[PDB]
Amino acid sequence: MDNIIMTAYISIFVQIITAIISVYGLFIPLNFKDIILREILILELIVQIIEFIFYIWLIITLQSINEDITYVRYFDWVLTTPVMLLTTVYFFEYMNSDDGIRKKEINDRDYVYLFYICLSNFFMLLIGYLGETKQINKMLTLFGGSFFLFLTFYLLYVKYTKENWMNYIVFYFMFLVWFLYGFAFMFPFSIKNQMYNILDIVSKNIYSIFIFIVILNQSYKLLLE
Numbered sequence: 001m002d003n004i005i006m007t008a009y010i011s012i013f014v015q016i017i018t019a020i021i022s023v024y025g026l027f028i029p030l031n032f033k034d035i036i037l038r039e040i041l042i043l044e045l046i047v048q049i050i051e052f053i054f055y056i057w058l059i060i061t062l063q064s065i066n067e068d069i070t071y072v073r074y075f076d077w078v079l080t081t082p083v084m085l086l087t088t089v090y091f092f093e094y095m096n097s098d099d100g101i102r103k104k105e106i107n108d109r110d111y112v113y114l115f116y117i118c119l120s121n122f123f124m125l126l127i128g129y130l131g132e133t134k135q136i137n138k139m140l141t142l143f144g145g146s147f148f149l150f151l152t153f154y155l156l157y158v159k160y161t162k163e164n165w166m167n168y169i170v171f172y173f174m175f176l177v178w179f180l181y182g183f184a185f186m187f188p189f190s191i192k193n194q195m196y197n198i199l200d201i202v203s204k205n206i207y208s209i210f211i212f213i214v215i216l217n218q219s220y221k222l223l224l225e
């Protein structure tokens with residue numbers, strides 16, 4: 001009980017600092033080419049709001065823990081993970097387009113493909129939810145969920161990446177961290193829930209700060225006056 005709550009606190013600590021940083025990042029002036037980074041940072045702040053509501057609920061609920069509340073995290077993830085995948089797409093497009101691109105052009109051109117990515121991701125979460133609530137066995141959950149995880153990342157890779165080390169860092173860091181949620185699924189309640197508490201820091205709040213640093217680095221001259 002204790003170590004779950006201590007990790008929830010650590011996660012909440014990073015979330016609050018990250019939220020403050022992201023808010024200031026909204027007000028950094030941007031050059032034409034970098035406009036989409038503020039768009040990304042709005043959608044990472046939306047993810048934070050959903051994140052936080054879950055954590056507050058969690059630390060209140062963990063006072064009188066009578067049952068296994070791991071499955072409640074899916075009501076978070078079913079909302080946050082598609083948003084996270086879209087921002088990843090927008091960040092890859094930013095990194096990889098020679099001309100300035102904005103999320104509207106992306107969304108109007110790619111909405112069908114984006115729906116396939118989010119459908120694959122929804123199936124991953126659905127299979128996890130069925131396993132996490134014991135409606136299918138753990139082995140079927142890990143194989144079915146991993147299949148869809150791989151499909152989601154494959155679709156992302158073949159459409160939006162380029163073959164270079166900046167892409168590999170962003171893609172494979174994300175891929176590994178997401179896979180580690182599947183790894184956590186294998187563990188008993190307390191250890192599982194602790195891992196998810198620390199994984200959220202990496203999957204959400206390190207991303208936001210990264211985007212913040214990219215914005216600051218791109219705009220520092222424009223900012224300074």
Ligand SMILES: *C/C=C(C)/C=C/C=C(C)/C=C/C1=C(C)CCCC1(C)C
Pocket residue numbers: 077080081084124125127128129141142145146149178179181182183185200203204
């Ligand atoms: C902000 C929350 C995020 C990024 C959470 C993502 C969760 C996953 C990628 C979970 C995936 C699963 C597997 C890879 C296999 C077992 C079932 C899941 C749902 C735990």
